[PDB]
Amino acid sequence: MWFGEFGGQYVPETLIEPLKELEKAYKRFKDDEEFNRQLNYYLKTWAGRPTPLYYAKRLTEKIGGAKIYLKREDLVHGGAHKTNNAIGQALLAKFMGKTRLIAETGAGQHGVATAMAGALLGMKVDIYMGAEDVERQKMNVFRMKLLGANVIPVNSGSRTLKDAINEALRDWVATFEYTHYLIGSVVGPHPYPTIVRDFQSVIGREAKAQILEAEGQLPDVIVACVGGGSNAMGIFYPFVNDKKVKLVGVEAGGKGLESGKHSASLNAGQVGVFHGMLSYFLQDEEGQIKPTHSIAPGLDYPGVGPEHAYLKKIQRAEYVTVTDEEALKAFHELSRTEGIIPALESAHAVAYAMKLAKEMSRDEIIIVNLSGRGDKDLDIVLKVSG
Amino acid sequence: MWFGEFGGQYVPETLIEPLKELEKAYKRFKDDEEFNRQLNYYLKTWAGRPTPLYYAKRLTEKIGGAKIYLKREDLVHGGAHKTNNAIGQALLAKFMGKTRLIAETGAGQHGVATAMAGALLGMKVDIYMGAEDVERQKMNVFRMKLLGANVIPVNSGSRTLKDAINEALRDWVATFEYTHYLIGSVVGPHPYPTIVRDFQSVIGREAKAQILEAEGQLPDVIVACVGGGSNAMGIFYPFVNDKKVKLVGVEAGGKGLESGKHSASLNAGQVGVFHGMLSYFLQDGQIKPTHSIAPGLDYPGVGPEHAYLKKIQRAEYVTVTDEEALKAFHELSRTEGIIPALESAHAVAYAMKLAKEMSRDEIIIVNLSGRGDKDLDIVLKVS
Numbered sequence: 001m002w003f004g005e006f007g008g009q010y011v012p013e014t015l016i017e018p019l020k021e022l023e024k025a026y027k028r029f030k031d032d033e034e035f036n037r038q039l040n041y042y043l044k045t046w047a048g049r050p051t052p053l054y055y056a057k058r059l060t061e062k063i064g065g066a067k068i069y070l071k072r073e074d075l076v077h078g079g080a081h082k083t084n085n086a087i088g089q090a091l092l093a094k095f096m097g098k099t100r101l102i103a104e105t106g107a108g109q110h111g112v113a114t115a116m117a118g119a120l121l122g123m124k125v126d127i128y129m130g131a132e133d134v135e136r137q138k139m140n141v142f143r144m145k146l147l148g149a150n151v152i153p154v155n156s157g158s159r160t161l162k163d164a165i166n167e168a169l170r171d172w173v174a175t176f177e178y179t180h181y182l183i184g185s186v187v188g189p190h191p192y193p194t195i196v197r198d199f200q201s202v203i204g205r206e207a208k209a210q211i212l213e214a215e216g217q218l219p220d221v222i223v224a225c226v227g228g229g230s231n232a233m234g235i236f237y238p239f240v241n242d243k244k245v246k247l248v249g250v251e252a253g254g255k256g257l258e259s260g261k262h263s264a265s266l267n268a269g270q271v272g273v274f275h276g277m278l279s280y281f282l283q284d285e286e287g288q289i290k291p292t293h294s295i296a297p298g299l300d301y302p303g304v305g306p307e308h309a310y311l312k313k314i315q316r317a318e319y320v321t322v323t324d325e326e327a328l329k330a331f332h333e334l335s336r337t338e339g340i341i342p343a344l345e346s347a348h349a350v351a352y353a354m355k356l357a358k359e360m361s362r363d364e365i366i367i368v369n370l371s372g373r374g375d376k377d378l379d380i381v382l383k384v385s386g
Numbered sequence: 387m388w389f390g391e392f393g394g395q396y397v398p399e400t401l402i403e404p405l406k407e408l409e410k411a412y413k414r415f416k417d418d419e420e421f422n423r424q425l426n427y428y429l430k431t432w433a434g435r436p437t438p439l440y441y442a443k444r445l446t447e448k449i450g451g452a453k454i455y456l457k458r459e460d461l462v463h464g465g466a467h468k469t470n471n472a473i474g475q476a477l478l479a480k481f482m483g484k485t486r487l488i489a490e491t492g493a494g495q496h497g498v499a500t501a502m503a504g505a506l507l508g509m510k511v512d513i514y515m516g517a518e519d520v521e522r523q524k525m526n527v528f529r530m531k532l533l534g535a536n537v538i539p540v541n542s543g544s545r546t547l548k549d550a551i552n553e554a555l556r557d558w559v560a561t562f563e564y565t566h567y568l569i570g571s572v573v574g575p576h577p578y579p580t581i582v583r584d585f586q587s588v589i590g591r592e593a594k595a596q597i598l599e600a601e602g603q604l605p606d607v608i609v610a611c612v613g614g615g616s617n618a619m620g621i622f623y624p625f626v627n628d629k630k631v632k633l634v635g636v637e638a639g640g641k642g643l644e645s646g647k648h649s650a651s652l653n654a655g656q657v658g659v660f661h662g663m664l665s666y667f668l669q670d671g672q673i674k675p676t677h678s679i680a681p682g683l684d685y686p687g688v689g690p691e692h693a694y695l696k697k698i699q700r701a702e703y704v705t706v707t708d709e710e711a712l713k714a715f716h717e718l719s720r721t722e723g724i725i726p727a728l729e730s731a732h733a734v735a736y737a738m739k740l741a742k743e744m745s746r747d748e749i750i751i752v753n754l755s756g757r758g759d760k761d762l763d764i765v766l767k768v769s
């Protein structure tokens with residue numbers, strides 16, 4: 001439940017029974033033979049795992065420093081690492097005898113991944129999405145509708161991701177006998193931060209076997225962008241006990257930390273309690289969630305998962321920021337140099353990796369988690385770049 | 387060079403030297419260890435091969451006949467099977483000392499694949515595209531530019547694929563000493579139909595091993611959509627000598643064969659010379675306009691090896707309309723959580739019809755040539 005002092009189940013009594021039922025169900029099925037056979041089967045045949053580990057030779061030789069490897073989660077079905085968590089939880093839901101999935105979404109990518117997994121498993125899917133986000137993400141909403149899901153606009157509060165989460169939680173109180181609430185990052189009340197991290201750990205376990213194969217040793221640095229923190233946890237977690245391996249999470253620096261338009265919860269936020277968890281959040285002086293910004297829509301959650309707050313506190317991982325402008329340059333650079341169009345979220349990790357590689361030697365090794373592909377972002381980049 | 391009465395090498399004398407060079411270099415490198423090391427390395431770590439073979443359990447149970455499997459080329463880097471060929475030829479070009487790739491594109495899909503491979507290998511990429519197609523494919527034009535390629539709008543004539551093909555050919559005549567002409571389908575003068583087919587054959591070799599693993603048997607039918615024919619040949623070719631395996635190519639029926647607005651060169655076209663090859667082309671003997679909702683099926687001809695397989699009755703060729711493809715696009719999305727390319731949706735649609743009339747112990751493999759992300763604008767408008 002806790003990662004040091006972070007985490008918890010900060011919820012109404014009305015949620016304690018669904019959550020206890022979830023943890024009981026998860027404890028049973030996490031190591032169940034049939035559950036893991038079925039999970040691996042869908043990950044392999046439907047999602048396309050394992051994803052490759054790619055040596056960005058041209059990018060590496062251009063910068064002239066450490067070897068830059070990319071964990072290619074951009075090749076997973078759907079175009080983002082989120083699918084690993086969507087399948088895991090949707091199948092867990094099915095094993096629990098649930099016939100409906102609900103989920104929050106802001107950028108729309110979790111909604112699409114949930115919709116995909118619900119379609120795969122023949123479940124009804126209802127997606128809660130703040131009206132501001134429904135407006136900004138027409139194409140992802142359309143994907144969700146194509147995949148058979150209902151998108152429910154959320155008109156309360158700030159009409160955004162934080163409000164979608166709260167409305168989903170209210171649905172779940174009424175409907176948990178037949179509904180599973182599929183949370184999209186390593187956030188929320190226990191047992192979600194653990195479950196989502198466990199379902200994403202496949203990334204780091206594959207990456208570990210692949211770097212040992214390609215290079216004969218562990219990497220010096222693993223770099224991943226941090227929205228809520230699931231892609232980063234997925235790749236960090238199997239290396240947590242490898243003391244040589246440096247872990248770096250990259251948050252959205254937006255227009256710059258001094259501008260106030262960013263979403264760097266760990267670098268600039270403070271401890272708080274929202275959405276059932278004690279963690280770091282960006283808050284106004286009255287202790288309410290403040291507006292956030294990033295060019296990458298998957299990085300604009302005002303909080304971060306408790307397990308990252310923990311890793312930062314104990315100094316196991318370093319957390320840094322990259323600006324909109326730096327992300328955007330790395331988006332173009334990776335496209336031109338390696339023929340891979342990254343997600344704007346992932347481009348943050350690429351931008352930082354490029355800076356870090358320059359100060360390191362040519363025998364040292366960086367793995368960047370390329371969390372997604374950039375097709376979803378082409379409308380944004382066309383407007384802001386040209 | 388010849389596939390029965392189809393194929394050949396109908397080019398001006400100036401192009402005979404570069405094509406003989408291409409043939410000799412191909413013969414040299416196709417079985418060369420270093421070439422195959424790099425190729426397999428790029429296919430594995432950059433493109434993500436092997437792609438999986440997926441049992442569409444819900445679609446299979448719902449229709450209630452044959453087992454439907456999908457070869458998931460929608461998961462290759464770029465979202466289309468075209469990447470397999472773009473890497474293969476771009477690597478061939480690099481091994482031949484070429485520094486520049488040119489290509490033709492109508493939908494933008496081959497242009498993007500070529501741009502991707504050229505970026506990977508550090509080669510200049512110029513893509514010829516008819517001005518009308520430029521306007522119709524804004525986002526693919528943007529991808530190509532993001533990847534470092536130049537998109538040359540062709541303003542002559544109708545400003546569409548045929549005008550872009552004529553311009554690329556003129557360019558290749560001038561620049562072949564440092565430029566490789568990267569043809570996007572099993573079409574063109576020898577040796578392109580053989581080369582592209584060999585670079586797509588990996589699809590079929592994987593599929594064969596995967597279905598043997600999954601089911602202990604070969605499929606009863608293999609279904610693939612057919613524009614120029616490369617994804618279909620890629621998946622067909624390793625099964626050509628397995629007599630049991632039926633091979634079904636699906637062409638664009640468009641608004642209906644009767645309507646005159648389709649791209650069904652094998653079913654309704656006539657034999658003749660276009661793009662350096664002798665094959666079926668849609669003609670009046672000038673090139674007639676073509677239509678499909680799936681922009682990748684807009685090519686006015688078809689590869690000579692398909693004309694041959696049709697002639698000897700080794701493969702059957704059918705058509706699916708815009709309407710049937712669109713329904714299968716929605717059906718797959720809803721039923722399996724896979725948004726297919728509109729091109730691949732033609733094969734899905736036909737396989738669904740066919741599965742209904744087959745036994746439940748029988749197996750259909752559909753080549754899911756691509757993903758539908760590129761088609762969401764088109765589908766938003768039409769649906």
Ligand SMILES: C[C@@H](c1c[nH]c2ccccc12)[C@H](N)C(=O)O
Pocket residue numbers: 104105106107108109110111161183184185187227228229297298299301
């Ligand atoms: C990043 C991701 C997301 C989905 N759910 C989240 C919860 C907390 C933090 C982030 C998320 C995004 N907003 C999406 O909906 O795709």
Ligand code: NA
Pocket residue numbers: 226227228263264265299300301302303304
């Ligand atoms: Na955050």
Ligand code: NA
Pocket residue numbers: 612613614649650651683684685686687688
């Ligand atoms: Na045709």
